[PDB]
Coordinates of C-alpha atoms in Angstrom, one line a residue:
Chain A
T4 CA -10.5 -4.7 7.2
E5 CA -9.3 -3.1 3.8
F6 CA -8.9 -6.7 2.6
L7 CA -12.6 -5.7 1.9
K8 CA -13.6 -9.1 0.4
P9 CA -12.4 -7.6 -2.9
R10 CA -14.6 -9.5 -5.5
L11 CA -13.8 -9.4 -9.3
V12 CA -16.5 -6.6 -10.0
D13 CA -15.1 -5.1 -13.3
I14 CA -14.4 -7.7 -16.1
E15 CA -15.3 -5.9 -19.5
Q16 CA -15.5 -8.6 -22.3
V17 CA -14.1 -7.8 -25.8
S18 CA -15.8 -10.8 -27.7
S19 CA -15.6 -14.5 -26.8
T20 CA -11.8 -14.7 -26.3
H21 CA -10.7 -11.6 -24.3
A22 CA -11.8 -9.4 -21.3
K23 CA -10.1 -6.6 -19.3
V24 CA -10.2 -8.7 -16.0
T25 CA -9.8 -6.5 -12.8
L26 CA -9.7 -7.1 -9.0
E27 CA -10.6 -4.3 -6.5
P28 CA -10.2 -2.7 -4.0
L29 CA -6.6 -3.3 -2.9
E30 CA -4.2 -2.3 -0.1
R31 CA -2.6 1.1 -1.1
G32 CA -1.0 -0.5 -4.2
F33 CA -1.4 -4.3 -3.6
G34 CA -2.1 -5.0 -7.3
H35 CA 1.7 -5.0 -7.4
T36 CA 1.7 -8.2 -5.2
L37 CA -1.4 -9.9 -6.8
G38 CA -0.5 -9.0 -10.5
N39 CA 2.8 -10.9 -10.3
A40 CA 2.3 -13.6 -7.6
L41 CA -1.2 -14.8 -8.7
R42 CA -0.3 -14.2 -12.4
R43 CA 2.4 -17.0 -12.0
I44 CA -0.4 -19.4 -10.7
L45 CA -2.4 -18.6 -14.0
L46 CA 0.7 -20.0 -15.8
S47 CA 1.4 -23.1 -13.6
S48 CA -1.4 -25.7 -13.2
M49 CA -4.4 -24.7 -15.3
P50 CA -7.5 -26.5 -16.9
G51 CA -8.7 -27.0 -20.6
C52 CA -8.0 -29.9 -23.0
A53 CA -5.8 -30.7 -26.0
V54 CA -3.9 -33.0 -28.5
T55 CA -1.0 -35.1 -27.0
Chain B
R15 CA 29.6 33.2 24.0
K16 CA 30.4 31.8 20.5
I17 CA 26.6 31.4 20.2
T18 CA 25.7 34.7 22.0
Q19 CA 28.6 36.2 20.0
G20 CA 27.5 38.8 17.5
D21 CA 29.2 40.0 14.4
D22 CA 28.5 43.2 12.3
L23 CA 26.5 42.4 9.1
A24 CA 27.6 45.6 7.3
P25 CA 25.7 49.0 7.3
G26 CA 22.3 48.0 5.9
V27 CA 21.7 44.9 8.2
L28 CA 20.9 44.8 11.9
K29 CA 20.1 41.0 12.0
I30 CA 20.3 37.7 10.1
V31 CA 18.4 34.3 10.6
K32 CA 18.9 30.6 9.5
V33 CA 17.1 27.2 9.3
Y34 CA 18.7 23.8 8.3
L35 CA 16.9 20.8 6.7
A36 CA 17.7 17.1 6.9
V37 CA 16.2 16.4 3.4
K38 CA 15.4 12.6 3.2
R39 CA 15.9 12.3 -0.6
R40 CA 14.4 8.7 -0.9
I41 CA 14.9 6.0 -3.6
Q42 CA 12.9 7.0 -6.7
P43 CA 13.0 6.7 -10.6
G44 CA 14.9 9.3 -12.6
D45 CA 17.6 9.4 -9.9
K46 CA 21.1 8.0 -11.0
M47 CA 23.0 4.9 -10.1
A48 CA 26.3 3.1 -11.0
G49 CA 28.9 0.4 -10.1
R50 CA 32.8 0.6 -9.7
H51 CA 33.5 -0.6 -13.3
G52 CA 32.1 2.5 -15.1
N53 CA 28.5 1.3 -15.6
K54 CA 26.5 4.6 -15.0
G55 CA 22.8 5.4 -15.6
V56 CA 19.2 6.3 -14.5
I57 CA 16.9 4.2 -12.3
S58 CA 14.3 3.6 -15.0
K59 CA 11.5 1.6 -13.1
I60 CA 10.9 0.1 -9.7
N61 CA 9.9 -3.6 -10.2
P62 CA 7.8 -5.9 -7.8
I63 CA 10.0 -8.7 -6.4
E64 CA 8.5 -11.1 -9.1
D65 CA 8.5 -8.5 -12.0
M66 CA 12.2 -9.6 -12.2
Chain C
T8 CA -14.1 -27.7 -6.8
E9 CA -10.8 -29.6 -6.0
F10 CA -8.9 -27.4 -3.4
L11 CA -5.8 -28.7 -1.5
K12 CA -5.3 -26.4 1.6
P13 CA -2.3 -28.5 2.9
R14 CA -1.5 -28.8 6.7
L15 CA 0.7 -30.4 9.5
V16 CA 4.2 -30.2 8.0
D17 CA 7.4 -29.4 10.0
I18 CA 9.2 -27.9 13.2
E19 CA 12.7 -26.5 13.8
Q20 CA 12.7 -24.0 16.8
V21 CA 16.1 -22.3 17.3
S22 CA 15.7 -19.3 19.8
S23 CA 12.5 -17.2 20.8
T24 CA 12.5 -14.7 17.8
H25 CA 13.6 -17.4 15.2
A26 CA 12.2 -20.8 14.3
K27 CA 12.3 -22.6 10.9
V28 CA 9.2 -24.5 9.6
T29 CA 9.7 -25.8 6.0
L30 CA 7.3 -27.2 3.3
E31 CA 7.4 -30.4 1.1
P32 CA 6.4 -31.8 -1.2
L33 CA 5.5 -28.8 -3.5
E34 CA 4.1 -29.0 -7.0
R35 CA 6.8 -28.6 -9.7
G36 CA 8.0 -25.1 -8.8
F37 CA 5.7 -23.5 -6.1
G38 CA 8.6 -23.0 -3.6
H39 CA 10.7 -21.0 -6.1
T40 CA 8.4 -17.9 -6.0
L41 CA 5.7 -17.8 -3.2
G42 CA 8.0 -16.6 -0.4
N43 CA 8.0 -13.0 -2.0
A44 CA 4.2 -12.4 -1.1
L45 CA 4.6 -12.1 2.8
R46 CA 7.7 -9.9 2.1
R47 CA 5.1 -7.0 1.9
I48 CA 2.7 -8.0 4.9
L49 CA 5.6 -8.8 7.3
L50 CA 6.9 -5.2 6.9
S51 CA 4.1 -2.7 6.0
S52 CA 0.7 -3.4 7.5
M53 CA 1.0 -5.9 10.4
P54 CA -0.5 -5.7 13.9
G55 CA 2.0 -6.6 16.8
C56 CA 3.1 -4.0 19.4
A57 CA 4.7 -0.5 19.7
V58 CA 4.9 2.7 21.9
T59 CA 2.2 5.2 20.8
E60 CA 2.6 8.3 23.1
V61 CA 4.9 9.4 26.0
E62 CA 4.9 12.1 28.8
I63 CA 8.2 12.7 30.8
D64 CA 9.4 14.0 34.3
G65 CA 11.1 17.2 32.9
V66 CA 11.6 16.7 29.1
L67 CA 9.1 18.6 26.8
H68 CA 10.8 17.3 23.6
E69 CA 13.1 14.3 22.7
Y70 CA 15.5 16.6 20.7
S71 CA 17.2 17.5 24.1
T72 CA 18.7 16.1 27.3
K73 CA 18.1 16.1 31.2
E74 CA 20.6 17.5 33.7
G75 CA 21.5 14.3 35.6
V76 CA 21.6 11.5 33.0
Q77 CA 25.0 10.2 31.4
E78 CA 23.5 9.7 27.9
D79 CA 21.4 12.1 25.7
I80 CA 17.7 11.9 24.8
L81 CA 17.0 11.8 21.0
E82 CA 19.5 9.0 20.3
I83 CA 18.3 7.2 23.5
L84 CA 14.6 7.4 22.3
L85 CA 15.7 5.9 18.9
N86 CA 16.6 2.8 21.1
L87 CA 13.7 3.1 23.6
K88 CA 11.0 3.0 20.9
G89 CA 11.9 -0.7 20.1
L90 CA 10.6 -1.8 23.6
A91 CA 7.4 -3.5 22.0
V92 CA 5.7 -6.2 24.2
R93 CA 2.4 -8.3 24.4
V94 CA -1.0 -7.3 26.0
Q95 CA -3.9 -9.6 27.1
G96 CA -7.1 -7.6 27.7
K97 CA -8.3 -4.7 25.6
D98 CA -5.6 -3.5 23.1
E99 CA -3.9 -0.7 25.1
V100 CA -1.9 -0.2 28.3
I101 CA -0.5 3.2 29.6
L102 CA 2.6 1.8 31.2
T103 CA 5.0 3.8 33.5
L104 CA 8.8 4.1 34.0
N105 CA 9.1 4.4 37.8
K106 CA 12.9 5.1 38.1
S107 CA 15.0 6.9 40.8
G108 CA 18.5 6.4 42.3
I109 CA 22.1 5.7 41.0
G110 CA 22.8 3.4 38.1
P111 CA 21.3 2.0 34.8
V112 CA 17.6 2.6 33.8
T113 CA 16.0 -0.5 32.2
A114 CA 12.9 -2.5 31.3
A115 CA 13.1 -3.8 35.0
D116 CA 12.3 -0.3 36.3
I117 CA 8.9 -0.4 34.4
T118 CA 5.3 -1.4 35.6
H119 CA 4.9 -5.2 35.0
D120 CA 2.4 -7.0 37.4
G121 CA -0.7 -7.0 35.1
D122 CA -2.1 -8.2 31.6
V123 CA 1.3 -7.5 30.0
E124 CA 4.4 -9.6 28.9
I125 CA 7.5 -7.4 28.6
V126 CA 9.4 -9.9 26.4
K127 CA 12.3 -7.4 26.4
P128 CA 13.3 -7.5 30.2
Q129 CA 17.0 -6.8 29.1
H130 CA 16.5 -3.5 27.3
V131 CA 18.4 -0.4 28.8
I132 CA 17.7 3.3 28.4
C133 CA 20.4 5.4 30.3
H134 CA 21.9 6.0 33.8
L135 CA 21.2 8.2 36.9
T136 CA 23.9 9.8 39.2
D137 CA 22.6 10.3 42.8
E138 CA 20.5 8.2 45.4
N139 CA 17.6 10.8 45.0
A140 CA 17.8 11.6 41.2
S141 CA 14.9 10.6 38.8
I142 CA 13.8 9.7 35.3
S143 CA 10.1 8.7 34.9
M144 CA 7.3 8.8 32.2
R145 CA 3.8 7.6 31.1
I146 CA 4.1 5.3 28.0
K147 CA 1.0 4.5 25.9
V148 CA 1.4 1.0 24.3
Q149 CA -0.9 -0.9 21.9
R150 CA -0.9 -4.0 19.7
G151 CA -2.1 -1.6 16.9
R152 CA -1.3 -2.0 13.1
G153 CA 1.4 -0.8 10.6
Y154 CA 4.9 0.7 10.4
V155 CA 4.0 4.2 11.7
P156 CA 6.8 6.8 12.4
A157 CA 6.1 9.8 14.8
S158 CA 5.0 11.9 11.7
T159 CA 2.6 10.0 9.4
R160 CA -0.8 12.0 9.4
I161 CA 1.5 14.8 7.8
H162 CA -1.2 17.5 8.4
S163 CA -3.5 18.0 11.3
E164 CA -0.1 16.7 12.7
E165 CA 0.8 20.2 13.9
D166 CA -1.9 19.1 16.5
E167 CA -2.3 20.7 19.9
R168 CA -0.8 17.8 22.1
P169 CA -0.2 19.5 25.6
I170 CA 3.5 20.6 25.5
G171 CA 5.3 17.4 26.6
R172 CA 2.8 14.8 25.2
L173 CA 5.1 13.2 22.7
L174 CA 3.6 11.4 19.7
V175 CA 5.8 8.3 19.1
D176 CA 7.0 5.9 16.3
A177 CA 4.1 3.5 16.6
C178 CA 5.9 0.9 14.3
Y179 CA 3.5 -2.0 15.5
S180 CA 4.9 -4.3 12.7
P181 CA 6.8 -7.2 14.5
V182 CA 9.0 -8.0 11.4
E183 CA 10.9 -6.2 8.6
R184 CA 13.6 -8.9 7.9
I185 CA 11.7 -11.9 6.3
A186 CA 13.2 -14.0 3.4
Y187 CA 13.2 -17.7 2.1
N188 CA 15.3 -20.4 0.5
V189 CA 14.6 -23.6 -1.5
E190 CA 15.6 -27.4 -1.9
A191 CA 14.4 -30.3 -4.1
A192 CA 11.7 -32.5 -2.4
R193 CA 13.3 -34.9 0.1
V194 CA 10.3 -36.7 1.6
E195 CA 11.5 -40.3 1.2
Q196 CA 8.8 -41.3 -1.3
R197 CA 10.5 -38.9 -3.8
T198 CA 13.5 -37.0 -5.2
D199 CA 11.4 -35.4 -8.0
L200 CA 9.5 -32.2 -6.8
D201 CA 10.5 -28.9 -4.9
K202 CA 10.7 -27.7 -1.2
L203 CA 10.4 -24.3 0.5
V204 CA 12.5 -23.1 3.5
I205 CA 11.8 -20.0 5.7
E206 CA 14.2 -17.5 7.3
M207 CA 11.8 -15.2 9.3
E208 CA 13.6 -13.3 12.2
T209 CA 11.6 -10.8 14.3
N210 CA 11.2 -7.7 16.5
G211 CA 11.1 -10.2 19.4
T212 CA 7.3 -9.5 19.8
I213 CA 6.7 -13.1 18.6
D214 CA 8.6 -16.2 17.4
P215 CA 8.0 -17.8 13.9
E216 CA 6.4 -20.9 15.6
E217 CA 4.0 -18.9 17.9
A218 CA 1.2 -17.3 15.7
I219 CA 0.5 -16.3 12.0
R220 CA -3.0 -16.0 10.3
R221 CA -3.4 -12.1 10.3
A222 CA 0.3 -12.0 9.0
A223 CA -0.7 -14.1 5.9
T224 CA -4.3 -12.8 5.5
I225 CA -3.4 -10.2 2.7
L226 CA -2.7 -13.5 0.7
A227 CA -5.2 -16.0 2.1
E228 CA -8.2 -13.5 2.2
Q229 CA -7.3 -12.6 -1.4
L230 CA -9.3 -15.6 -2.8
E231 CA -13.0 -14.8 -2.1
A232 CA -11.7 -11.9 -4.2
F233 CA -12.3 -14.1 -7.4
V234 CA -15.6 -15.9 -6.6
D235 CA -18.9 -15.4 -4.4
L236 CA -19.1 -12.3 -6.6
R237 CA -21.2 -9.7 -4.6
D238 CA -19.4 -6.3 -3.6
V239 CA -19.5 -2.9 -1.8
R240 CA -20.1 0.9 -2.3
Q241 CA -21.5 4.3 -0.9
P242 CA -23.9 7.1 -2.3
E243 CA -24.5 10.9 -2.8
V244 CA -27.8 12.1 -1.2
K245 CA -28.2 16.0 -0.8
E246 CA -29.5 19.1 -2.8
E247 CA -28.0 22.6 -3.3
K248 CA -30.4 24.9 -1.3
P249 CA -32.6 27.3 -0.8
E250 CA -35.8 29.4 -1.6
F251 CA -39.4 30.4 -0.4
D252 CA -41.9 29.8 1.3
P253 CA -39.9 30.4 4.7
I254 CA -41.2 27.3 6.4
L255 CA -37.7 25.8 5.8
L256 CA -35.7 29.1 6.1
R257 CA -35.5 28.9 10.0
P258 CA -32.8 28.1 12.6
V259 CA -33.5 25.9 15.7
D260 CA -34.7 29.1 17.5
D261 CA -38.2 28.5 16.1
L262 CA -38.6 25.0 17.7
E263 CA -38.9 25.8 21.5
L264 CA -36.4 23.1 22.7
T265 CA -33.7 22.5 25.5
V266 CA -30.1 23.9 25.8
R267 CA -27.7 20.8 25.6
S268 CA -29.7 19.9 22.4
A269 CA -29.1 23.5 21.2
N270 CA -25.3 23.1 21.9
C271 CA -24.8 19.7 20.1
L272 CA -27.3 20.5 17.2
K273 CA -25.1 23.7 16.9
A274 CA -21.9 21.6 16.7
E275 CA -23.7 19.3 14.1
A276 CA -24.2 22.6 12.3
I277 CA -28.0 22.2 11.6
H278 CA -28.5 26.0 11.4
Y279 CA -31.6 25.5 9.1
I280 CA -34.5 23.3 10.3
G281 CA -35.2 23.0 6.5
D282 CA -32.7 20.1 6.6
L283 CA -33.6 18.9 10.2
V284 CA -37.0 18.2 8.5
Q285 CA -35.3 15.5 6.3
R286 CA -32.0 14.2 8.0
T287 CA -32.6 10.5 9.2
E288 CA -32.8 9.9 13.0
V289 CA -29.8 7.4 12.8
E290 CA -27.9 10.2 10.9
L291 CA -28.2 12.5 14.0
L292 CA -26.0 9.9 15.8
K293 CA -23.0 11.4 14.0
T294 CA -21.6 13.8 16.6
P295 CA -21.1 13.0 20.4
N296 CA -23.0 14.5 23.4
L297 CA -26.2 14.0 21.4
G298 CA -27.6 10.8 23.0
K299 CA -30.8 8.9 24.1
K300 CA -32.7 12.0 25.5
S301 CA -31.7 14.8 23.0
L302 CA -32.2 12.4 20.1
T303 CA -35.7 11.8 21.6
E304 CA -36.7 15.5 22.0
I305 CA -36.6 15.9 18.1
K306 CA -39.5 13.5 17.8
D307 CA -42.3 16.0 18.8
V308 CA -40.6 19.5 19.0
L309 CA -40.7 19.5 15.1
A310 CA -44.4 18.3 15.2
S311 CA -45.3 21.1 17.8
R312 CA -44.7 23.7 15.0
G313 CA -47.5 22.1 12.9
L314 CA -44.7 20.3 10.9
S315 CA -43.0 16.8 11.0
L316 CA -39.7 15.0 10.8
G317 CA -39.2 12.7 7.7
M318 CA -40.2 15.2 4.8
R319 CA -37.7 14.9 1.8
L320 CA -38.7 17.2 -1.1
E321 CA -37.8 17.5 -4.9
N322 CA -36.8 21.2 -4.7
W323 CA -35.5 23.3 -1.7

């Protein structure tokens, strides 16, 4: 179905700190769901390491 | 015979015709909103449930 | 790789169309936001059940009424269209309303001794007035998908439907209402995390403790979307036509072939064998009435000319 296994095809780096990051194709506007629901995940419980 | 009634349409018109339209003027930006206490203004974006 | 995919949790059934599963423990805030995702799927795009098409015993359009009823048809059909059910073979059933004689007209006057569960056996349509009066119809019904009103295609929707063949509000989606609520975590190990609570209520087509995966799939199958990173796409393949020598400048007339072939290759518009020389054999299976024998004639009638199939060229 149009949940067409929508892999992250189009990333476009800007130099070793930043890319465009895009996810396609989506259900007649469904970037409105993912871009606010999943974007909260990306601010909740994430990896890396630092001073404590 | 209020439907099959006729009326004169003045010298210059034998007949007249009409159509009526139920225009479903949906929720959209640029349209205007308010509340009872004098707050009045334009709908200025539609926001995903989490964009709020 | 450290996924969690949690299971098993809770039950609180209330009445067939509403039950109340809930979720704890949750990590530090998850229950505060996640219940807004399904608020799209459990409205717009869901499979479930609806009426698709109707044909009636003396009523060419719903914008009207029938001389013997005690109620009137447009604002009846607005209530009839909600009759949505379940089906257990192939997706469709063309049901019938079988009704004659004095009194109410109901979901108990409809064909129901087959692969179908009419979960609405208390719906009512109208009345009849004499012991020989009638109201009857065919009723196409599917599980289908979406929230489709009786005008959605918006053009080619003037379409030639034999006058009385009503297209219908195929609103297959078994929910519009869905929402959620929250607590602190209450699992007696803790008082120190969060907890999700669900308030789904339905079209009666299902209960919230009966089935779910396709109704959460535009959120679960949105994960492969970020990994396993191979994708999907289609091409352009033709050239702009045409010049000498007139070996390609010929219709099917030149081939010496049969008549049903000459009707369906005419529908498939191949009025120059200059492109029948290079169209793929699988790409002739693209219009019906063109099957296993006509598709097999092509394989030597082209060769009989002193030509062949399978001859792409860099200029035509």
